């Protein structure tokens, strides 16, 4: 339900890919790990996954 600024990092937890997100217009203290299925940011995921 929130705009995503950028993906900071990626991990696997409990067999799920999770991304650590900076949320647009929120402080870095609000950064959270979210499971990949929670994202609708194809362009960011591909840009992250291509450049990592």
């Amino acid at each position: 339900e929130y705009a995503v600024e950028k993906i900071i990092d990626r991990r696997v937890r409990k067999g799920m890919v999770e991304y650590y997100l900076k949320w647009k217009g929120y402080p870095e203290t609000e950064n959270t790990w979210e499971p990949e299925n929670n994202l609708d940011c194809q362009d960011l995921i591909q840009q992250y996954e291509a450049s990592r």
């Binding site: 339900e1 705009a3 995503v4 959270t32 979210e34 929670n38 994202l39 940011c41």
Partner: peptide, 6 residues
């Protein structure tokens, strides 16, 4: 360019 907040 959005995501759900778990």
């Amino acid at each position: 360019q959005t995501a759900r907040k778990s």
